[PDB]
Each structure stands twice: as C-alpha cells, then as structure tokens.
Design a protein around this ligand. Sequence first.
Ligand SMILES: NC(=O)C1=CN([C@@H]2O[C@H](COP(=O)(O)OP(=O)(O)OC[C@H]3O[C@@H](n4cnc5c(N)ncnc54)[C@H](OP(=O)(O)O)[C@@H]3O)[C@@H](O)[C@H]2O)C=CC1
Ligand SMILES: NC(=O)C1=CN([C@@H]2O[C@H](COP(=O)(O)OP(=O)(O)OC[C@H]3O[C@@H](n4cnc5c(N)ncnc54)[C@H](OP(=O)(O)O)[C@@H]3O)[C@@H](O)[C@H]2O)C=CC1
Ligand SMILES: CCc1nc(N)nc(N)c1Cc1cccc(-c2ccc(C(=O)O)cc2)c1
Ligand SMILES: CCc1nc(N)nc(N)c1Cc1cccc(-c2ccc(C(=O)O)cc2)c1
Ligand SMILES: O=c1ccn([C@H]2C[C@H](O)[C@@H](COP(=O)(O)O)O2)c(=O)[nH]1
Ligand SMILES: O=c1ccn([C@H]2C[C@H](O)[C@@H](COP(=O)(O)O)O2)c(=O)[nH]1
Lengths: 531, 528
Amino acid sequence: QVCDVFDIYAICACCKVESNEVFNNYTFRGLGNKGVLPWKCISLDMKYFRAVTTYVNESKYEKLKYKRCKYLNKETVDLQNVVVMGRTNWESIPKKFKPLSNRINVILSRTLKKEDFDEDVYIINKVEDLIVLLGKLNYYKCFILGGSVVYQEFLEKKLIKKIYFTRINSTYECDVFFPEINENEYQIISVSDVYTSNNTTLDFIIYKKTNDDEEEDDFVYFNFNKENKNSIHPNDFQIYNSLKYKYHPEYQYLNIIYDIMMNGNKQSDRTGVGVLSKFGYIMKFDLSQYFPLLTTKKLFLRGIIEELLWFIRGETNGNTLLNKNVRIWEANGTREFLDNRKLFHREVNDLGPIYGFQWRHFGAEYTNMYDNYENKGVDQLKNIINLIKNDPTSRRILLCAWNVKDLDQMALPPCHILCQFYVFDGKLSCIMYQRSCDLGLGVPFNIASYSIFTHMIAQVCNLQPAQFIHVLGNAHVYNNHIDSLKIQLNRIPYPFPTLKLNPDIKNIEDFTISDFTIQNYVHHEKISMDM
Amino acid sequence: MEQVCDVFDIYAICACCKVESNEVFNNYTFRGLGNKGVLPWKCISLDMKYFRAVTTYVNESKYEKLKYKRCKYLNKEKKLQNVVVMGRTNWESIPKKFKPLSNRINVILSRTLKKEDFDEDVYIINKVEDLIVLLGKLNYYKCFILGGSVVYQEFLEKKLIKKIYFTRINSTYECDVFFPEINENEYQIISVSDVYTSNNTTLDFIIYKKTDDEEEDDFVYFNFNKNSIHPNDFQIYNSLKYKYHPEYQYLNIIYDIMMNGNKQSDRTGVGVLSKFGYIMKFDLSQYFPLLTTKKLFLRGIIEELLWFIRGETNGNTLLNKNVRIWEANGTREFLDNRKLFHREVNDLGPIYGFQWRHFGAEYTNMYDNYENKGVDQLKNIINLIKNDPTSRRILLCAWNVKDLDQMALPPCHILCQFYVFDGKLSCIMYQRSCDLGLGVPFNIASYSIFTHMIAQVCNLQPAQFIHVLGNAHVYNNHIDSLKIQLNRIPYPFPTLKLNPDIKNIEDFTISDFTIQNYVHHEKISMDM
Ligand SMILES: NC(=O)C1=CN([C@@H]2O[C@H](COP(=O)(O)OP(=O)(O)OC[C@H]3O[C@@H](n4cnc5c(N)ncnc54)[C@H](OP(=O)(O)O)[C@@H]3O)[C@@H](O)[C@H]2O)C=CC1
Ligand SMILES: NC(=O)C1=CN([C@@H]2O[C@H](COP(=O)(O)OP(=O)(O)OC[C@H]3O[C@@H](n4cnc5c(N)ncnc54)[C@H](OP(=O)(O)O)[C@@H]3O)[C@@H](O)[C@H]2O)C=CC1
Ligand SMILES: CCc1nc(N)nc(N)c1Cc1cccc(-c2ccc(C(=O)O)cc2)c1
Ligand SMILES: CCc1nc(N)nc(N)c1Cc1cccc(-c2ccc(C(=O)O)cc2)c1
Ligand SMILES: O=c1ccn([C@H]2C[C@H](O)[C@@H](COP(=O)(O)O)O2)c(=O)[nH]1
Ligand SMILES: O=c1ccn([C@H]2C[C@H](O)[C@@H](COP(=O)(O)O)O2)c(=O)[nH]1
C-alpha cells in the first residue's frame, strides 16, 4: 500500500547478456558494465527517460497530496518528480548532467552526507528514510533509477507500483543485472511500438503490481443499434484482454486473429476442415524500424527465402526446392494433386506457369518446367525495377502473378495476387494483395516473405525500405488452429528482430541464401498449429 | 448568467421527413413532422428504437453532479428517470397502449385539459414556466421535448433547448405540420451518425448544439515521439465531435492526404499530395454510397459499366450516348503519344471490357467479334458465386500484363474479389491509382452498382463494397475545391433500385437502375 500512497515506480533499460536458446522476460536483464552502461548510446531510450522522469500533471496532484496526508494522519504535507539513485549510479552520471534537471534528486547511500551536497539534493541512509522524506515533500511521482542493488531491495519489499522497462534487443557484456521479476507479483500491462535507435531495436513495456461528459452520453446514443458472436470464450484470452496499450506492431496480426475468432463467419471449405472468415483487412509494418518476424511463436526463414530466390530465377520446377528440403510446394506437385487439378499431362512437381514464370515471362506459352524461356514473355520483375529507378513517381509499378489465361495450367492459382510499389524521398513501400489468407499458418510466413522481398527491391534500387503493407482478402482461421491461436494470443510479443542483407548485392538476380541474416530474433516457443 | 436549458438539461428530440412541394437542398429539406394528426410515415422502427434508447437512458453515477448543479441554481442544499414533455395534440396522437411512455416521467402541456381529464400517471402543466418549476421539484436525469410543432417552436424561440436530437427521414411524405426552421446562428450540427435503412427508407441521426488515472499518464509516455494547409480552413470539419456517416471514410482520407501527404510530381505534371494504402467499407444493405457533399450524376458511369459488360472497346459507342468519360483517351494525339500509331481514333484497345470477356485473346480492333476467344472471366465469376460460393478464387482481373501497352491506358481498377456468406455478397476492389478529388467518388459508385448487379443475378443480397486504395493522391489544383467540400456536412445517402426481372448480367439497360432520394450539396468544379 505504501507504493500506492507515494507512487513509487522503477524505470530501467536492460539489454541481453553474453553467455536453441530459450527466451523469456528475464532475457532482458543487462544493466551495466565496468561502472557504465553496457551500450555506447541509445538516444531514444534517453528521450523516453527524460519524458517519463520529468512529466508532471499538476491538475492531479491535489488528489495525490490529499491521499498522502490522510495516510500519514496529517492535514498538510509539511511541482517536480523525485528520482532515486544508488551512490554508484550517482557517481557514473557525468558532472555536467548532475543534478538531474527539474527533478528532486535523492541518493540512497551509507557513506555520504548532505554537507558534501546541495540543500535541494537529498541524501537518505536507509530505504524507509525515503518514505519519511516523501511524506515531507511536494512531488508528483517518485522514480527509482537503479542501480541493481537499489532495484533489488525496493522490489523485494513490494515498494514498486509499476516498472517502466525498456527492452534493448541487442547483446552486450554486463557485470550487473536487473533482478528477476516474479511474474506472480508483477505482470505486463502495456507494450509500445517497436523502434530502431543506434543500430538496435528496442521497445517499452510497463509492469504492474498485480491484484465534457455532455458528449459522452451522445456516444451511447449512437451505439443504440449494436450487437460477441462465436463460441470462443473471453476468459481464455485473459492476458490478451488484460493489456491496456497494445502498440506493438505484432498486435496488428494478433488483433485480426481475435477479430476473426470473435466475429468470423462459420463456413466450409474444400478440405471440409471448416473456417472462420472475414473479408478485408490491411496491416502496415515499418521496415525502417524493424523486421516483422512474429515473436509470439518461432518462425523459420530458410525455406521461404529459397522460395523467393526460386521465384526470382523464374523457376517452376518443384524438384529444385525439394532437393534443398524446401517442401512448401510438395503437396501441390504430386501425381494425385495434379490429376485432381485435371493436369493429367503434367509431370510430377511441374507446377506450371506459377509465380516465377509470370514474374519473368508473363504471356509466354508454357510448355514444361525444363524449357528455355529466355526473352519470352514480359519480364515484369525487370520492368518494375527499371520503373523504380527511372520513373519513381509512376503509379504503374505493379508486379502481377494472377495471369487469368494461365490459371488452370497452374498447380494452384496464386494467393499473392500482386505487389505495388511506391517511392517517395528515396524510400520504397510495397503493398501486397492476398486473396486467401490462412491466418494461423500461412500469413506469418507471408509477411516475412514480402518484407524480405521489399528489402531486396529497395537495395538493388539504392533506396531505403519504408513500409510493407499487407491487404487481406478472404481472411480465415481454420477451426483446427483455434486452440493454438488462443495460446498465442495470450503471449506478449518481444521486440522484433532486424534483417541484414549483404550490401554488395546490387542486382535482383544475384542474391544467394548466405546474403540474408536475421539478427536478435527473440521469440516465444514454437507452436504446432494443428495440435 | 447560467442557462435554464443547461441547469435542467432540456433537449429536443424529433424525426423529420422531406415534404412534397433541379432543386437546392439544405437542412430545412428535412422538416416534415406530421399529417392528419398522426405521423407522415407508417412506421420506421429503427427511429422508434433510437427514440426509446435516448429518452430512457440515464447514467445514475452522473446524477450526483446534476443534483448539485440544480441545487446551486435554485439556492438549496425508485430508479432515476428522464422527463418527457409533449404538447396535448402530440399526446393524443400516441396509441393508448403506449401511454404514458414506459419508464419516463410524462409531462403534457395543455390549456384546454386539466388533470381530471386524464386517467394516466402524467403531469399536466399549462405554461412553459411551470415546467421549469416542476423540474426544480423532481428527481430526473434529463428532460426531452417530444413536440409537436407548437411545442418545438416556442421552446426553440425561448432558447430552452440545449441539443436537438434530429432524425433525418430520407423520403418524401405528405405533411401538414413542420419542424421550425433551425436558426443556424443559434444551433450548429456537432455530430452525425452512420446511415441506416429501415422500412424501405434511409435515415441518419444528427445532433444540433446551441452555439484508474494511472493509465492516463502511461498514454502520455507512449506518445513521447506537415503541409502549408491552414487550421481555420476546416472549422466546420474539425468542430464535429462524432463523424460516423460513411461519407467521412472518403472525407477523412482527403483530410489525411492534405495534412500528411507527400509532395510529388506525376505523369501529368500537375503535382499531387499522395499516400499509399487505404481501405473504405460501405454497407450496401443499408445505403447507396453516392457522395452528398457535392453533386454527382450516374448516367455516364452506368453506361460505362454496361459497355464494360458487353465486352466493348469502341469509344464511339459511349460518345453516341453523350458519355465523354473516355473521349480524351481516344484521340489521335493521345493514341500517338501512347505509340499506338496503327490504332483508329477511339479504339481504346484491350481495356476492361475486353479483359472481362476475352482475357488472353489477341486484340485486333474494336470491331472484331471475339466470341469464344479468351477467358470469359465475367461468366466464370458468376458461375463460381452460384455454384462454389465459398471459393477464395472468385476474382475478376483487368490488369493483363501482356496487353498493357496496347491499352489506351492501363486500368486503375486492378481487380474485384467477391465473398459470399449467408446468402449475401461482398466485393473488394483494388485501385492502384486513385484521384481522390475527381475519380474516387465515381469509382465508389461504379463498383457499388456492379456489386448489386452481380448479387441480383446470383440470387444474393449485396452486403459490403470494400475499396482498397493503392497510390491515393489529391491533385494540387483540387485543393481549394476540396477544402470547401470537407466543410460540408453529408446528407443521408440515397438508395439504388434494380429492375428485379433482370436475371442475367448481360441483360441490364440504363432504365433498370433508379437512384432514389439523392439529397446533395451544390455541384463543385474541382479545378478552378
Ligand atoms: N541501464 C539502467 O537502466 C541502469 C543501469 N545502471 C548501471 O548499474 C550499475 C550500478 O548499479 P550498482 O552497481 O548495483 O550500484 P547502485 O547504483 O545500486 O548504488 C549502489 C550504492 O547504493 C548504496 N546503497 C545500496 N543499497 C543501500 C541500502 N539498502 N541502504 C543505503 N544505501 C544503499 C551504496 O552506497 P554505500 O557504498 O555508501 O553504501 C551502494 O554503493 C552502473 O554500472 C550503472 O551504469 C544503474 C541504474 C539503471
Ligand atoms: N415526427 C416527430 O418527431 C413529431 C411529430 N408530431 C406530430 O406533430 C403533430 C402535433 O403537433 P402540433 O399540431 O404542433 O400540436 P402540439 O403537439 O405542438 O401541441 C399543441 C397543443 O399543446 C398545448 N400547448 C402547447 N404549448 C403550450 C403552452 N406553452 N402552454 C399550454 N399549453 C400548450 C395546447 O394544447 P390545448 O390546445 O389543449 O391547450 C396546444 O394546442 C401531430 O401530427 C404529431 O404526430 C408530434 C411530435 C413530434
Ligand atoms: C539508459 C539509461 C536509463 N534508462 C532507463 N529507461 N531507466 C534508467 N533507470 C536508466 C538509468 C539512468 C538513470 C539516470 C541517469 C542516466 C544517465 C545519465 C547520463 C548519461 C550520459 O551522460 O550519457 C546516461 C545515462 C541513466
Ligand atoms: C417518430 C417518433 C419520434 N421520433 C423522434 N426521434 N422524435 C420524436 N419526437 C418522435 C415523436 C414521438 C414520440 C413518442 C411517441 C410517438 C409515436 C408512437 C407510436 C405511434 C403509432 O404507433 O402510431 C405514433 C407516434 C412519436
Ligand atoms: O502463400 C500462401 C499460400 C496459401 N495460403 C492459404 C490460403 C488458403 O488457406 C490456402 C489456399 O487455398 P485456396 O484459397 O486457393 O482455396 O492456402 C496462404 O495463406 N499463403
Ligand atoms: O477510373 C479512374 C481512372 C483514372 N483515375 C485517375 C488516377 C490518376 O490520377 C489518373 C490515372 O493516372 P495513372 O496512374 O494511370 O498514371 O486518373 C481514377 O481515379 N479513376
């Protein structure tokens, strides 16, 4: 209750530490090294630090000072925030910075005296002397800045109301570590957008201690005709519904799953499996700040990169993929699947004029997967690259795989109908339109595929990737993914990884598997969607 | 200097239709209150439901503040209910089985009748000032004036109304009593609802106005991290509190492009502000989304759509109907600048109609008979909807990569995808390039009509038209005109009627389409 009275919070920034790894909240625990911060400088976290440790709402202080006085059984107290540091933490701060501007500076030490310090720079000897000092002060909120020992003992005494935790998604050498937060005591309630600052991704999470209104009526009136549809239970998404602010871009995906589960229409499909379906969604991912590889389950990327490279080569030979143990297309190339497609005269694993053929040879007559198609058909891929380089404000930079004439000769019609690209201020955005979206299994791979593809096109055009924009047409959750996706919805995302391409690759056809590196992929446990 | 209507929370609620009398439209278009002592229309049940929800809703936790405020003004220390006030004529028009209005404190204004003339649990008052006295003596949440016209007129005249809850019934009926003309200097629209259909009419609801705190701070922390267009230029648009009318999907995108768009050149050289990736959804079961903040005619785009369905590429066919949509793209100079030197004037090449009916056939000229050449995807999608409704492959594609350079210009409307659930048909159209000022209003109308035509010949009802915008841009020379448009308040949308006898997609003609009850602001020239 003390932490509720005096509004005592922790704020920290933790990196990953040098040692299939297992990831959990304690993965981010690196506080310092050699008396200083483990990283060189992360200025977005510092901006966030100053905004949090200095923000004050005077219009809410009267209620706070009222509550503090009543608790002390006083009527008067005898506007800034309080910041509390350990002595080691106070020493490491450069002299130019000290004392922390517009903050009431409090050092918890056992070898200091106010006689070496200011009148306004307070020193306390034990933790309980802060509760005394706060009772005598006028302050909005009290922030505990560390370090490790200060965090440890404040936390063990349940003196912390909330933990403002920056997750630094890179690994450094550390010799002091944030204490493990007991998830029975504290639970994550808000997660921020993902950012890039100083060559690392980071995000901001909030741990919580566990336990004109004239126009507000008009809101109810305009809701008078509202319906909450399906046999999914609210109590199953407890963690998901308990979160207040879900700004992490992975919630763009997770919110669509929840929407389809709650409001999807029950329908059959070819496999008789049954789906919940909705029609029409857009997701947007900021490739300049992160690589949107889902973190609430484990995803593998080798297969889909090879598939992309196989596309760019113009290949339609499934064997090429199968010999690399990339089996994305195997079921679509069997004798039985082709026969059921009425492709009686198609060789096994000859998928016909699918993506690769349309990207490099749209309009050419397909014969078989071994034929030579050099200079036959429209080379869309080359054309869009040249439009991007030479006519970047063109509204006609489209790459289309839905060749209406060839659909029946394909093993199956493409789910990814087209990409359209957009260039502004030397930056490349790409929209992909998908007609059919397996949310549980297919869509997570599809976001990665076209996010990688957007990086590749941008690099060979000497542009920076900006946004990948994903338009979902028939968007469905297979009934046999529902249990698994319920598990997934209650996992809290980690800060996204980043993608690195070999910078020397300046032509779209020159990438190989080794030119792609995923960095700092922190993820929850893998999940079998069909359990 | 307090106001009686603010101390005692006095509101008016009403429903108005259009009245029988090349026309101008304004707010006073909706003024029909009653006829022959009863309502002008038979029964519009959705308005009844809205009427009930508003006049019975109370928030108990707010009454404490309300009681204190009224006590202050007056200089003093069962379930809470609203008060409703009716003129005597209004009271007598209500069927007996609904009198007194359930869960409300009923107050009747009369001089010719007194309490002895009433069996029911009601207050009689014989002048407006006795209402104020009564309200000072009662426990109530809010006080709603229900009419009729005489009651409205004097309460408005005396400025005793804090807000008017106003239903716009978008159809015409014979009337003999009318809502008073609202004085725009006195009352302004602050909110507008979604559009609905009920009992074969559209309607919306508009509002006139008299002219754990811990999570509060976390929001501020998470927010710790452009164009020479001016605030005062959107006073009406930004003064609105609730903008739920579906036309705001379009107006908000205009506003978004103006405030955040990227400055770019383009093929025409005009210059644009542009953004990338938008989606609008329109519920065709509830309204036809023909924009009302400016005037639009549909005869041309319907002839165009029928010309598509016939597989035609001959521009002269449209021009002979005085439909000039494609005229500039058919000229010798336009065709030559496309390198189409061997193309006859107004032969548009293998554009939408040819791709819909003959995808993959070699185009020769606009006069050829292409019967049984290429893929008839229009027939195919109709068959899939009828016979394979859960297919995720029901797509109609005009972007034929092979044929693009032979087209007068490449299509903007890349594809249509359809969706069937529970006997209702939805359509997604993806537009690669979207002239928000000129083309998008028409494009919304075209594919909304196309969705109705496909649904009907497949024995389905239309549900959603969904419009995905790719490169969405506003031309610089449209900006001043669009600033005007964004400060207009949409009217309830019209409805679209198809001749129900038409059972095959190819059998429609121009007279099988009717747009009814189009109420709209004045026409705007987007340029100059
Ligand atoms: N990235 C981040 O978010 C943060 C990083 N850091 C890093 O952490 C490191 C410092 O943390 P740490 O090394 O744990 O040292 P601290 O910052 O914990 O300060 C330790 C000092 O605090 C005093 N102290 C500790 N417990 C008590 C107590 N119960 N009563 C009275 N005085 C007490 C002692 O002073 P005396 O010696 O007089 O007893 C001790 O020397 C630095 O490398 C710094 O960069 C620090 C804070 C946050
Ligand atoms: N569509 C809508 O939203 C509404 C429609 N209507 C329609 O309106 C019509 C009736 O409205 P209208 O004809 O204008 O008659 P009203 O309902 O306005 O009531 C008129 C009567 O109310 C009494 N009255 C009014 N003001 C006072 C006052 N200040 N002091 C004392 N008595 C007063 C008098 O009754 P007496 O003559 O006994 O003194 C007067 O004749 C009907 O057609 C009804 O259906 C009604 C309400 C709203
Ligand atoms: C990464 C910091 C941090 N972030 C978050 N979110 N919570 C924290 N408790 C800290 C530690 C901290 C506290 C006070 C000052 C400084 C500091 C001063 C000066 C300098 C400098 O001179 O560079 C750097 C840091 C750090
Ligand atoms: C159109 C309603 C209305 N809507 C709005 N938004 N504001 C209004 N002030 C009214 C007038 C009104 C009030 C109370 C009852 C009746 C009524 C009921 C039943 C019948 C009947 O069954 O005939 C007739 C009238 C009308
Ligand atoms: O890259 C892909 C390929 C397939 N699917 C899913 C969508 C459907 O669940 C199924 C394709 O079957 P149809 O929609 O074509 O019937 O595969 C994807 O989500 N992404
Ligand atoms: O039905 C149409 C046809 C054209 N346009 C606009 C979009 C562009 O402003 C211009 C076509 O230019 P390109 O994208 O094709 O360059 O016309 C539309 O909005 N709707």
